[PDB]
Amino acid sequence: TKQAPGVSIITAEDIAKRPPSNDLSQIIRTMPGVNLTGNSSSGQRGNNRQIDIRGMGPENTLILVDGKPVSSRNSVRYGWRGERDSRGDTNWVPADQVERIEVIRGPAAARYGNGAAGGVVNIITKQAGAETHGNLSVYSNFPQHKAEGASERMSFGLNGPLTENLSYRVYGNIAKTDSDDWDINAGHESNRTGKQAGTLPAGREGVRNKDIDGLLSWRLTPEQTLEFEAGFSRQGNIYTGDTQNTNSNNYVKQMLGHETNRMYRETYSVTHRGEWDFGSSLAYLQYEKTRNSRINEGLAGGTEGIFDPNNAGFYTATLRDLTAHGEVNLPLHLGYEQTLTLGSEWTEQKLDDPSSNTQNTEEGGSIPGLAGKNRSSSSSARIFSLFAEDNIELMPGTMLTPGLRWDHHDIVGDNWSPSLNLSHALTERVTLKAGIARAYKAPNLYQLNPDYLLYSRGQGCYGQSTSCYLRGNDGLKAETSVNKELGIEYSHDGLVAGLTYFRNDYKNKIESGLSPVDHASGGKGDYANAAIYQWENVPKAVVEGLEGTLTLPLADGLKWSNNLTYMLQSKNKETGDVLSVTPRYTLNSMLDWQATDDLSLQATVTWYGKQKPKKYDYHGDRVTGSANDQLSPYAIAGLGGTYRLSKNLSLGAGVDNLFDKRLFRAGNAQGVVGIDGAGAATYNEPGRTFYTSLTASF
Numbered sequence: 001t002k003q004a005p006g007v008s009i010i011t012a013e014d015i016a017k018r019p020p021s022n023d024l025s026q027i028i029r030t031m032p033g034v035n036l037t038g039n040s041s042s043g044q045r046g047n048n049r050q051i052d053i054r055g056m057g058p059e060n061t062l063i064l065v066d067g068k069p070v071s072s073r074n075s076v077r078y079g080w081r082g083e084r085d086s087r088g089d090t091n092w093v094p095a096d097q098v099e100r101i102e103v104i105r106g107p108a109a110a111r112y113g114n115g116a117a118g119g120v121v122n123i124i125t126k127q128a129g130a131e132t133h134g135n136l137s138v139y140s141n142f143p144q145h146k147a148e149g150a151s152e153r154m155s156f157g158l159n160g161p162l163t164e165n166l167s168y169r170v171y172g173n174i175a176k177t178d179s180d181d182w183d184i185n186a187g188h189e190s191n192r193t194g195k196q197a198g199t200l201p202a203g204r205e206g207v208r209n210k211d212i213d214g215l216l217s218w219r220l221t222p223e224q225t226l227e228f229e230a231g232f233s234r235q236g237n238i239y240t241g242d243t244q245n246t247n248s249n250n251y252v253k254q255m256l257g258h259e260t261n262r263m264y265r266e267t268y269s270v271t272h273r274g275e276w277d278f279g280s281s282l283a284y285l286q287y288e289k290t291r292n293s294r295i296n297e298g299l300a301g302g303t304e305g306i307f308d309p310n311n312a313g314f315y316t317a318t319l320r321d322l323t324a325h326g327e328v329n330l331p332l333h334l335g336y337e338q339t340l341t342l343g344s345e346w347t348e349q350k351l352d353d354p355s356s357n358t359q360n361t362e363e364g365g366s367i368p369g370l371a372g373k374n375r376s377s378s379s380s381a382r383i384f385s386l387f388a389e390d391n392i393e394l395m396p397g398t399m400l401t402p403g404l405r406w407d408h409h410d411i412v413g414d415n416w417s418p419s420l421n422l423s424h425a426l427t428e429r430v431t432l433k434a435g436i437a438r439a440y441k442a443p444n445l446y447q448l449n450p451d452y453l454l455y456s457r458g459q460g461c462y463g464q465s466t467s468c469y470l471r472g473n474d475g476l477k478a479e480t481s482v483n484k485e486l487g488i489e490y491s492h493d494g495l496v497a498g499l500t501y502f503r504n505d506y507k508n509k510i511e512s513g514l515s516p517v518d519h520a521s522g523g524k525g526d527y528a529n530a531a532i533y534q535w536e537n538v539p540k541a542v543v544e545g546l547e548g549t550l551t552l553p554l555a556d557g558l559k560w561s562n563n564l565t566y567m568l569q570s571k572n573k574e575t576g577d578v579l580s581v582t583p584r585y586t587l588n589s590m591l592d593w594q595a596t597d598d599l600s601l602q603a604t605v606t607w608y609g610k611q612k613p614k615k616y617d618y619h620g621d622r623v624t625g626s627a628n629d630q631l632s633p634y635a636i637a638g639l640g641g642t643y644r645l646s647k648n649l650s651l652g653a654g655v656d657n658l659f660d661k662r663l664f665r666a667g668n669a670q671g672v673v674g675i676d677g678a679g680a681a682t683y684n685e686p687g688r689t690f691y692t693s694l695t696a697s698f
């Protein structure tokens with residue numbers, strides 16, 4: 001099946017039956033314990049929501065492609081409120097070239113290491129077979145309302161052998177999601193008066209996609225295979241007015257419909273696979289060069305996250321990420337029938353950002369130890385890891401899996417990650433599963449680097465109205481989370497029913513500081529001698545919720561499937577406020593009717609629960625007025641089908657959001673000078689949308 005306590009699988013047939021518009025987050029989010037949200041409660045960049053697992057934030061959601069990590073979004077500025085102006089790392093592989101997607105959540109994912117506190121998403125691509133095969137896929141949607149941007153997607157795949165010890169696979173994809181119109185949120189915007197009059201919260205950022213990848217599989221011996229593959233990906237956007245604080249200037253209005261940020265992503269990887277008497281072996285090297293070229297942006301209060309016209313033009317943040325890994329596997333026949341995996345892993349993250357370390361100290365005063373101008377554009381860190389997994393069978397069916405992962409981070413230090421996962425067959429139909437593990441999140445190179453500096457004249461400062469600075473902190477402790485999961489599941493004859501309770505105890509979550517650690521000297525007027533905050537380690541935090549699934553075979557050709565997330569609590573224990581805004585529940589329901597041998601119709605409905613914004617503003621004072629707005633529960637229904645016309649060609653068509661339920665971004669969560677708050681109305685929900693698909697394959 002596709003659901004077990006902690007794990008979920010998405011097949012290629014699953015993707016073809018609920019086709020994404022462009023980004024795979026559309027289909028990944030429908031899994032239990034998975035939401036689409038930002039990394040904090042600011043509402044900033046609210047239309048750029050990424051995959052969140054169990055309310056731990058997208059920053060704790062490790063994206064893999066065939067086991068190799070994706071770190072491209074680390075090349076984007078990590079804002080004061082923990083929000084990069086990034087669309088996530090799920091749009092790198094085209095939808096119709098994915099074989100399957102694995103989603104590992106909670107304690108079963110801590111073994112993967114740094115950034116797996118929420119979970120792990122492994123995007124697995126279709127490989128070459130014993131023959132030569134190829135495919136051609138075309139998706140195109142048509143929203144009822146013209147303001148919402150439409151998506152068009154064309155991809156191909158091609159695979160096969162060349163010699164008798166050499167195989168290959170290539171795929172190319174070209175896709176475009178039109179941006180929402182600039183004025184799509186007009187009339188729904190928050191109250192805007194004074195200098196901020198007319199400023200609109202923006203719709204969904206558009207994107208152009210150029211993806212190219214080719215693979216060479218060389219099986220030199222019976223037991224040994226060596227693979228080379230290279231990837232070239234480009235993502236240019238279509239700007240529609242998005243700024244951090246929903247303010248606007250003239251540089252913005254000039255760039256509407258223009259390309260203000262482009263991500264070149266380059267990936268080369270040498271993979272080796274070996275399998276013999278004693279067991280199996282795997283080791284790879286990957287180099288990921290990300291170039292994040294975008295228009296320069298200010299770094300001070302309201303000018304944070306807006307096109308800075310004093311320094312017009314593009315800069316280029318460059319991210320060289322190097323990951324090498326290797327593991328061997330061992331079946332053991334001892335006092336208990338077990339399996340043993342032994343592996344190591346090394347990563348290097350080089351970050352060149354010529355624009356984030358530029359905020360000077362002429363208005364708040366010089367900071368001792370921090371130069372005012374020409375600070376280094378470079379940040380870097382490395383983690384070396386060793387690990388071992390003991391997959392034990394105590395008695396046939398029942399399984400126990402303790403494991404230890406050790407990481408040495410060249411700035412923060414040592415981390416011991418002890419995982420223990422238990423699966424008990426209480427019956428041939430019922431399985432109880434429990435697990436507890438202490439996951440790992442090393443600070444990102446913006447929270448670390450003490451040359452990274454943001455400034456505010458007071459509005460963003462916690463516990464005052466005077467000007468203040470926020471600064472990096474290279475003494476930070478890593479984020480650690482104890483992820484308790486306990487679940488049970490019944491599985492027999494297509495009938496599956498399961499419920500799981502998770503409670504991740506979130507120790508040392510990095511966030512913007514609360515108490516000032518210093519004060520500067522110098523500056524201008526009322527702003528001089530501004531206080532100094534640094535990125536802290538929030539002592540304790542908690543997330544808690546429920547994961548459920550129920551699949552009933554109504555008839556032989558009919559299947560009713562259900563996935564349920566219910567978020568019980570998400571609390572920053574130090575401040576008390578929420579740490580992430582997710583719906584109270586999410587219930588996805590699909591009815592899969594196999595109408596004929598050569599036809600299949602699908603009906604989908606997704607219930608979203610209530611959504612509550614944050615209690616306290618950037619000051620820490622309880623918000624007032626329209627910043628308390630909540631989003632009411634609502635549902636999105638859809639119909640679709642896939643009409644097979646031959647063993648070579650297939651056609652799909654359907655409608656998303658049958659009832660045209662629409663939501664509009666009104667701004668960020670809280671109010672500021674001139675711009676009232678928007679509360680939970682931080683994103684645009686798309687309306688009724690028709691779509692069609694085409695797949696030719698041999």
Ligand SMILES: [Fe+3]
Pocket residue numbers: 300301302456457458459460
């Ligand atoms: Fe300000």
